[PDB]
Amino acid sequence: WMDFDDDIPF
Amino acid sequence: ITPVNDETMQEINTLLIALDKTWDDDLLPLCSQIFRRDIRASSELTQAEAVKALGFLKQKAAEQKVA
Predict the structure, then answer these.
(1) Where exactly are the structural domains of chain B?
(2) Size of the A and B interface in Cβ pairs below 8 Å
(3) Which residues of chain A have a CB within 8 Å of the CB of B19?
């Protein structure tokens, strides 16, 4: 599960 | 737990505007994927969820200039 702690693009 | 308060909401809104992003287009979709519930409005987050989103927006706003 991707998380807000991951280097998610936005 | 309990719903997002107005001070936290206003901090998120400030950063969305600085990032040229929106609830409808950007953050509500992402929150739905991350928290795996179906979130259709900014007031429908919990405070705990909002604090996580705010930390993520701060990282984004600190990282680089908006193009």
Answers:
(1) 6-58
(2) 19
(3) 10
